[PDB]
């Protein structure tokens, strides 16, 4: 087998792809595919080589290397997915960074190169900032080169600048985290007045706040995002950030529904209705900078989904704990946006387990990504480590080597097949059955102890996703205690599909098999009944009928 990488996370139209393999195998071939069709083949020779993809924008490809056997069988050696996109917003693959102290350039490069290998196309820099009310440490004319952050940890400006430049070299976007409305207790009371805060009562008595303990320097006080004094103040803060640090945009966070809260004047703050004017103010102030905003458990999503955001973002909490609740967020977000935006989910796996050091439960993580990706979602989960908590610097849980390598196939798969997964089409009811009893099918939402079939019409293709819950001991996506089961492999499983058109080609791809390379399947057809066999199902397989 081989490791197979490209130089960048994504490629603009017209840019050349440069590949690296760790070793060459003889009698081998490189196969370039678009949606399962071979568009180029060439001999596997040099360990470095280049390819200029087709010029078409927003297209995914797979590249697969195979050794050819004398008998005409082929053996997959490795695969890599490629994304040709002029901009990340269509197919976001969001990652994070969380440590910005005295980290060497070489260590920084390793972190970025790893994210690059997962094809991460933008990075949320979390808790880089000086203060929620003043994200730039120092002033534009006199920056602070080192600052202490909200947990009194050192942050080096040179680390921040370095990371941005490294991310840019891989074609990634860099988004700075801040709240929409946060103020820490060292704010300058000459600049943020009492009239701007949100209060827990109608008489401007007790400020609303996010309570923090050690090691945080302050609780987080809350301002009104519709307050134009706050909007102009934070706009200036943002401009100051962008003059010092070459961030591409602002990742806007929030605290979610604050309940019973008031403006200074005793009126209702109704914060979800404040976010739209806030977003438009931030955009107008820095018209060339990107925005994304977290709808914390969908709070604000309806109100903001039509605003100037690159894509939608949902942090998923109770009671949205079932697999079907993930898919409901994705469906709701498409509708809220009038089909203008795809979604990234922040959906923290193994959350209770992550209360102590340990490792992620591989099958939990993979099953959740299979569901998210199959339904055209994306998952913010990778940075220096994988997320177990909303506090991104928490690195309690490690990924096993197996999880790292499996997840690289899943990211390859959702990159290569992005045109099938989140580029139009209609969800449909499957008309497929087992033809040998080796598996038992359900549909969506999923049944425990069955393979779920999900259908989608995309162009002249009919897609079936098989998502395997045969061995599931829960339909809760979070796998909070790390108990979800590894699914047993199902092999050479016959399926009978009803299909009312003439079938030309059926092909299979799975991140669990052959690196997600497309496998054309033999089929027969008798009336509307189409019979074929899939090689392997473990977590997720995709069947495409053309």
Ligand X SMILES: OC[C@H]1O[C@H](OC[C@H]2O[C@H](OC[C@H]3O[C@H](O)[C@H](O)[C@@H](O)[C@@H]3O)[C@H](O)[C@@H](O)[C@@H]2O)[C@H](O)[C@@H](O)[C@@H]1O
Contacts to Na ion by CB under 5 A: 79, 99, 253, 384, 409, 412, 515
- Minimum distance between the CB of residue 384 and Na ion, rounded to whole angstroms? 5
Q: Smallest gap, in angstroms, from Cβ of residue 269 to ligand X? A: 18
CA distances from 19 to 68, 81, 117 (A): 21, 11, 11
Residue from 240, 390, 423, 481 touching ligand X (CB under 6 A): that is 390
Give the residue with the Cβ less far from ligand X, 150 or 506: 150
Task: Say if residues 189 and 163 touch (Cβ distance below 8 Å).
Answer: no
Asked whether the bond before 443 is cis by omega within 30 degrees of 0, the reply is no
Q: In the complex, what is the shortest distance from the CB of residue 103 to Na ion, in angstroms, rounded to a whole number? A: 5
- Buried b / exposed e over 21-53, threshold 16 CB at 10 Å, is beeeeeebebbbbbbbeeeeeeebeeeeeebeb
Rounded to 5°, angle at Cα 140 from 139 and 145: 70
In the complex with Na ion, the residue whose CB is nearer, 196 or 510, is 510
Q: Which residue number, 222 or 517, has a Cβ lying nearer to ligand X?
A: 222
CB of residue 362 vs ligand X: minimum separation in angstroms?
21
Stretch that binds ligand X, among 18-26, 60-68, 261-269, 386-394 (CB under 6 A): 386-394
Binding mask 470-499 for ligand X (x = CB under 6 A): ------------------------------
Residue 210 interacting entry, from ligand X, Na ion, none, C-beta within 5 to 8 Å by type: ligand X
Nearest distance in Å: CB 452, Na ion: 24
With CB under 5 to 8 Å by kind, the binding choice for 391 among Na ion, ligand X, none is ligand X
Residues 221-280 that bind ligand X (CB under 6 A): 253
When CB distances are held under 5 to 8 angstroms depending on the partner's kind, the choice from Na ion, ligand X, none that residue 150 binds is ligand X
Who's near 224: CB < 8 A, 6+ residues apart? 181, 196, 197, 198, 230, 263, 269, 271, 274
Q: Which stretch binds ligand X (CB under 6 A): 16-24, 71-79, 383-391, 436-444?
A: 383-391
Q: Spell out, one character per residue from 181 to 200, where the chain touches ligand X: x when CB under 6 A holds, - when not.
A: -x------------------
Question: Exposed (0-12), middle (13-18) or buried (19+): which is 286, by Cβ within 10 Å?
Answer: middle
CB of 390 to ligand X, least distance (A): 6
Shortest Å distance, C-beta 428 to Na ion = 29
Q: Which one among 5, 168, 389, 461 touches ligand X, defined by CB under 6 A?
A: 389
* Residue 394: closest CA among 426, 430, 338, 349: 349
Q: 432 is in the binding site of which of ligand X, Na ion, none (Cβ under 5 to 8 A by kind)?
A: none
**How many of the other CB atoms lie within 10 Å of CB of 75?**
14
DSSP string, 66-77: EEEPTTS-EEEE
Quick one: 447 exposed, middle or buried, by C-beta within 10 A (0-12, 13-18, 19+)?
A: middle
Among 18, 394, 434, 483, binds ligand X (CB under 6 A): 394
The DSSP code sequence of 322-372 is: BHHHHHHHHHHHHHHTTT---EEEE--TTTTGGGSSEE--HHHHHHHHHHH
**Beta carbon of residue 210, minimum distance to ligand X (angstroms, whole number):** 6
Q: Per rule CB under 6 A, is residue 220 in the interface with ligand X?
A: yes
Q: Could you tell me if 426 and 331 are in contact, meaning their C-beta atoms sit under 8 angstroms apart?
A: no
Distance CA 95, CA 9 (A): 12
Neighbours of 212 (CB within 10 A): 14
Give whichever of 251 and 283 is closer to ligand X, judged by the CB atom: 251
Cα 412 to Cα 60: distance, rounded to the nearest angstrom:
10
Q: How far is the CB of 149 from ligand X (least distance, A)?
A: 8
Q: Which residue's CB is nearer to Na ion, number 92 or number 95?
A: 95
CB 375 within 8 A of CB 454: yes
In the bound complex, which residue of the shown chain has the CB atom lying closest to ligand X? Answer: 391
In this structure, what DSSP letter does residue 475 have? Answer: -
- The listed partner (Na ion, ligand X, none) that binds 109, CB under 5 to 8 Å by sort, is none
Q: What is the 3-state secondary structure (H, E, C) of 404-458?
A: HHHHHHHHHHHHHCHHHHCCCCEEECCCEEECCCCCCEECCCCCCCCEEEEEEEE
Contact between 357 and 397 under an 8 Å Cβ cutoff? The reply is yes
Number of residues that bind ligand X (CB under 6 A): 14
Q: At closest approach, how far in Å is the CB of 409 from Na ion?
A: 5
Tell me how far apart the terminal alpha carbons of the chain are, to the nearest angstrom: 31
Contact between 315 and ligand X per CB under 6 A: no
In the complex, minimum distance from the CB of residue 211 to ligand X, in angstroms, rounded to a whole number: 8
Strands annotated E in 187-337: 209-210, 220-222, 249-253, 290-296, 312-315
In the complex, the smallest distance separating the C-beta of residue 220 from ligand X, rounded to whole angstroms, is 6
Instruction: Using the rule CB under 6 A, give the single segment among 80-88, 388-396, 408-416, 435-443 that binds ligand X.
Output: 388-396
Site membership for ligand X, residue 383 (CB under 6 A)? no
Q: Which is nearer to ligand X, 19 or 130 (CB)?
A: 130
Structure tokens at 319: 């009671």
**The tokens of 209 are what?**
């706040």
- Pick out residues in 123-162 that bind ligand X (CB under 6 A): 127, 132, 150
Q: Are 223 and 183 in contact (CB under 8 A)?
A: yes
Is 210 a binding residue for ligand X by CB under 6 A? The answer is yes
Nearer CB in complex with ligand X: 300/515? 300
Nearest CA to 120 out of 407, 393, 374 is that of 407
> Which CB, 66 or 130, lies closer to ligand X?
130
Nearer to ligand X, 89 or 296 (CB): 296
Binding mask 87-126 for ligand X (x = CB under 6 A): ----------------------------------------
Least separation, in Å, of the C-beta of 191 and ligand X?
19
Q: Footprint of ligand X on this chain (CB under 6 A)? A: 127, 132, 150, 179, 182, 210, 212, 220, 253, 355, 389-391, 394
């Amino acid at each position: 087998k081989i490791t197979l990488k490209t130089d960048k996370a994504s490629y603009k139209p017209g840019e050349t792809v440069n590949f690296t393999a760790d070793k060459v195998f003889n009698s081998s071939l490189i196969r370039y595919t678009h949606l399962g069709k071979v568009i180029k083949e060439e001999t596997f020779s040099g360990t470095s080589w280049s390819w200029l993809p087709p010029s078409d924008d927003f297209q995914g490809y797979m590249v697969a290397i195979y050794q050819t056997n004398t008998d005409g069988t082929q053996t997959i050696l490795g695969t890599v997915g490629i994304d040709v996109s002029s901009d990340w917003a269509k197919f976001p693959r969001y990652g994070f960074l969380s440590e910005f102290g005295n980290i060497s350039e070489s260590d920084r490069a390793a972190v970025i190169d790893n994210l690059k290998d997962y094809h991460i196309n933008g990075i949320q820099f979390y808790d880089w900032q000086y203060r929620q009310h003043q994200p730039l440490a120092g002033t534009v004319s006199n920056p602070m080169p080192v600052w202490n952050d909200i947990i009194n940890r050192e942050v080096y400006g040179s680390t921040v600048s370095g990371y941005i430049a490294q991310a840019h070299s891989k074609n990634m976007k860099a988004m700075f985290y801040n709240l929409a409305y946060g103020v820490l207790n060292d704010y300058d009371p000459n600049l943020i007045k009492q009239q701007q805060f949100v209060y827990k009562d109608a008489n401007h008595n007790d400020k609303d706040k996010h309570e923090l303990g050690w090691p945080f320097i302050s609780n987080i006080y809350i301002t009104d995002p519709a307050n134009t004094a706050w909007q102009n103040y934070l706009a200036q803060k943002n401009d100051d950030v962008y003059k010092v640090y070459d961030f591409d945009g602002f990742h806007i966070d929030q605290l979610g529904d604050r309940g019973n809260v008031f403006r200074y004047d005793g009126t209702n703050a109704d914060l979800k209705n404040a976010f739209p004017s806030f977003i438009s103010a931030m955009k107008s102030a820095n018209t060339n900078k990107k925005l994304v905003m977290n709808a914390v458990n969908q709070y604000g999503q309806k109100e903001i989904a039509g605003k100037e955001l690159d894509f939608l973002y949902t942090e998923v909490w109770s009671p949205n704990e079932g697999f079907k609740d993930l898919t409901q967020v994705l469906t709701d977000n498409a509708a809220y946006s009038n089909n203008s935006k795809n979604t990234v989910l922040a959906a923290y796996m193994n959350y209770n387990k992550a209360n102590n050091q340990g490792m992620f439960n591989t099958p939990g993580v993979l099953l959740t990504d299979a569901v998210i990706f199959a339904f055209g979602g994306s998952h913010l989960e990778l940075g220096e480590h994988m997320l177990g908590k909303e506090y991104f610097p928490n690195k309690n849980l490690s990924m096993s080597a197996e999880l790292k390598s499996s997840l690289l196939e899943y990211y390859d798969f959702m990159t290569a097949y992005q045109n099938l997964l989140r580029d139009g089409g209609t969800y449909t009811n499957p008309t497929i059955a087992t033809g040998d009893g080796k598996l038992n099918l359900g549909s969506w939402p999923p049944t425990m102890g069955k393979v779920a079939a999900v259908g989608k019409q995309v162009g002249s293709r009919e897609i079936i996703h098989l998502l395997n819950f045969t061995n599931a001991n829960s339909l809760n996506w979070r796998d909070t205690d790390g108990t979800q089961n590894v699914p047993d492999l199902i092999k050479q499983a016959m399926l009978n599909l009803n299909h009312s058109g003439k079938v030309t080609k059926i092909w299979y791809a799975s991140p669990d098999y052959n690196g997600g390379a497309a496998v054309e399947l033999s089929f027969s057809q008798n009336g509307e009944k189409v019979n074929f066999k899939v090689p392997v199902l473990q977590y997720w397989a995709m069947i495409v009928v053309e």
